[model samples]
Target: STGSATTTPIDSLDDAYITPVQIGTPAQTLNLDFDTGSSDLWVFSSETTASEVDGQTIYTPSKSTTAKLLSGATWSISYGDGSSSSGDVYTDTVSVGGLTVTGQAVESAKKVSSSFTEDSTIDGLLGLAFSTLNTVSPTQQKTFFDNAKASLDSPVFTADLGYHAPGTYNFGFIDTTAYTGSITYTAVSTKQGFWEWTSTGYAVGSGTFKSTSIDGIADTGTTLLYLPATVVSAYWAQVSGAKSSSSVGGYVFPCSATLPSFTFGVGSARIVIPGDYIDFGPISTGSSSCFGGIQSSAGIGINIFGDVALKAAFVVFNGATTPTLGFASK
Candidate 1:
């Protein structure tokens, strides 16, 4: 019955994260994905095979006049989740909230896997992120914020993923009524969207972080926190006693033991992780092992914080405004 207060974020890793826009006629509502990692909007096409489409909405672009095909354009995307899609470029009129964005770049995938269709609840991914790193480079893309920035009052975007609430990614202006105390903010490194992070060490409870020097990127696309060797070894020692119970993808610790809290600081922004949120899942053997919530990036190229961490609080990517990030309860 209640809504979250729109607030300015405390930190940022600009790319000025964009919120996915839901598009379709009143007769239909299409759920789309907004991603910063890549650009260009894409959806299932009539040409897709029945068994190949999964977890997406197959909208007939033929129905929308604004959805135009660029005779020579073809597109493809490879997801970190081990999935990929291929299609052609088309221009479409997309609506976000109530603002109509015309002649937007869209990709109508001719070939998609079954994974795109299994999720019957979703219509398609509404990409709100930026236009770089896409299957088609420099495809002259327009992000939601990029199109709506001038129409809105402020140049800010915010995200809230916490208890008893749907994970929200909102634009226009940040409703600051949601945060507590003076929000601590951190500026992004400016080179890209990934936040620069430095780990001092890992400690259990009141203990000290055994490692002192580990630094890398913090990402929202990922779900679990990642640490360097020294920090991982140091922190795991304390969690090892209880980690065996959690070997799955994300953090899921036991209800019986009291786990200590862990904190991370980015410039002026400081976040303390509550023990309960540190682990996830059932402790049983057949069950997927719960993650300590944070894992090692031994083989992984970039260390990213998976969905496990983003769901914990509010995240802001301050671009032209105050570039910083903030994390808190609501």
Candidate 2:
């Protein structure tokens, strides 16, 4: 986590389709999330300790010396089951990736959830689902893209999530490499960032689960893959040597065994989420096991194509514009 590098002061560059915006007019960097569930950009302060950070980025308001939170606008936000974080206000210039966006509505939570309070790397969250689900906007709430478009010299914004990792779900921008050839993509209906599509089948340990119909969505805000009980039972069965460790949530196995390869065919492209992703640990800790990125989700939905599955393929978030994300070669 302590990697030192040169800090680049960004003015304008090509963000695929995503344009940069300035908060408070060049006061800070306008941050944007590659999210599809909520539409809001939330950042933490330098003063925020590991106990105050989550799986998001943290912005520096004090360092900028040009930030100010809104007046009389207290807020608290929580995930599907996670607790909420409450804070007053702190405004400064927020940048998107590196571009700056001014006059952006940021949520400064003084009290964050346990998950956030534990992860130190996470500082803020930027929601880019849609204007309908946006919590921050020009009219009391403008999504990150909304402000980015208004501030950026251009109107087109594109994000490539899997460009670095497994071809992540990019926002604002669209990468051509993912759709360069004859890859057919499906049209998705927006249900707040919760974009859902039907899966032909599921795959586990080098086996194909074509018969398994999965009605799932891709959510970056979520941590691991939360799968349905029926799927979990079947998946664990194929994991071989995988045992039930429900106390910790899902079935956690010795990770030392060889994991079989799996793939999920949405339409034409069959996304293969490598087995290493099933293991949980920092890159420093080098023990691979079958983690419950796909844990028990009661009997509700089929499966959640979380960050693990997402980073494995090119995800397209067809918002106001067609934003495409290409995965890094896996």
Candidate 3:
């Protein structure tokens, strides 16, 4: 009956984070990556082969009295990074924080790619993208948020992502205490099943802001900011030791380089990203080389504003008929 639910996001490997979710009757907790880039709440499951699962936890549908097989239905999906999973479907009760949704589609993975099997920290993915993107075969399924939105006071959720630190994902409400100053708003296009918005332009370091428009997706599941190749080259060019490394891939720079800050315009408001944040830490212990957090979207078709860009602001993904985005300093 309350219009809100909040969960602490657990940071993992500095690459991404996971939110704990309880699924099925009697409840089994699973740490899931809340991915805005995709739509499908799939988990490691009893159907997955034991040898391939390794340290990851699996969801046992048979153990839950509320679980029911959605016979003749199945799902399969692949990421831009080539990670993928495929499985049969089960409808069960799913809860996030204190919010609960009955008959939520919970894909039980029977097979997973190396990209997923090797990363043992995450038990599953909680897709936050629009339900139209659901991968189920017979019919598309609504997200937990969608199922619970009508009961919520507001159709909205906020993401407070921090660098290598604990964050919070709040549903159906905004926590004013999590951000500073006023929240700047932007229009979002959900046509592609993503929270997409266009920036008026951006500037590297203290350079004058350019007027070039860049269309991109605000993706919580992605780790780095991906832009056009020309834009990435422009930022890296400012650093003396920074060069496109064929070995490391993308742009790499000496750890000691005084990296410049990055700023993007949002409806006349500017969100500045610190130079240190752009450095993305060292490549390895032996070498003082570091990778740039901002890189080219290249083959991905569309640009992405991932954790590196998101952590700089408190984000509100408003689920109105015409979704609007709100941002403020954290």
Candidate 4:
């Protein structure tokens, strides 16, 4: 069996996690968001104009002997949340933990949106989605993981996201020790380039588990758990002062309000999301108000199991066959 690479992922403002990766000959290190929601390895680079680039460390391709330009090739991406990045392409050696891949297409951004520029800590996004979704023109590029999976003993990676704490992202092998209890497997449909599945049902705080058949994607880049508006309303109705706040956005409640537990069904397995996790910190630094972690996905057209729900489970992204998602309590 091929050994796995384990790296601790730092919490990014309680919204996302950042993992360190090395690229090129001299091994320049860059902290990137290993996002399953996207499919391109793009970085702020020397090619980016100083005005377009923020405080992020730019990838200096010329500094690396192994770097080679993909002659005339270009790439660009626009995220669902309006964040975007676009630039030239280069092929180079990329390393993560103990694993490395040669000639991996590394997109070096010349332009990026304010959303990315403002988040100075992340050098770029290391996409973990399917290669078919890569944004390179003339020829779409394969993600670093896609190029490396064939050499690994098994095509699998796992995410162990934490609640306001550091977590782990393991490649090639699953760390059975990180999670407790048996792993519950659910079939995944990825025609849309997302790890999507339908929940058999859900329940609110010991209430009846309704068979809503909610279809959603497991997105690490997203910050909150987004469900249907009706589903969110039902859960908040149980709370005394919970109400939809347009100004505060999503749903809000008194900081002292007791939140109910939430549960979702996968196959025959039931994973409970703690009420404490439902309180997504306070609305602000000194406000006695809090925002609901589980908010409405009405605008998105699809539900999202973001960091909040993901932190509750040790998730396996198995690309072996038809993609499958396995979950167990951490």
Expressed as tens digits, the lDDT of each residue in 25-122 for candidate 1 is 32234555444344457766665666766645566767665556777777777766666678777766666555565666667778765555554443
Q: Give the TM-score (vs. native) of candidate 1.
A: 0.75
Clashing pairs in 4: none
- TM values, all candidates: 0.75, 0.71, 0.95, 0.94
Pitting candidate 2 against candidate 3, the one with the higher TM-score is: 3
Give Cα-based local distance difference scores for all models. 0.53, 0.52, 0.86, 0.86
**For model 3, how does the per-residue alpha-carbon lDDT over 1-330 read when each residue is reduced to its tens digit?**
333433344433358888888999889988899988898999999999776797887899999999999999999999978889999999999988788889999999999998788888889999988999999998888887778878777889888887667788888888899998889999899889999999878899999998888999999998899999998999999999888877887889998898999998888888888887787777776779988899889978999999889988999999888898888987
lDDT of 4 by residue, 100-205 (tens): 8999999999899998888878899999888888999999899887888898767988888877677788788888899998899898888888889888888999
Best by TM-score: 3
lDDT for model 3 comes to: 0.86
Candidate 3: where is the Cα deviation over 4 Å?
1-13
Compare candidates 2 and 3 on lDDT and give the better one: 3
Model 4 TM-score relative to the real fold: 0.94
Between candidates 1 and 4, the TM-score winner: 4
**Tens digit per residue, CA lDDT, model 2, 91-199:** 5555544555556677766667786566444445666656666443234466656666644443443323342222233234445665434344554545534566666
lDDT of 4: 0.86
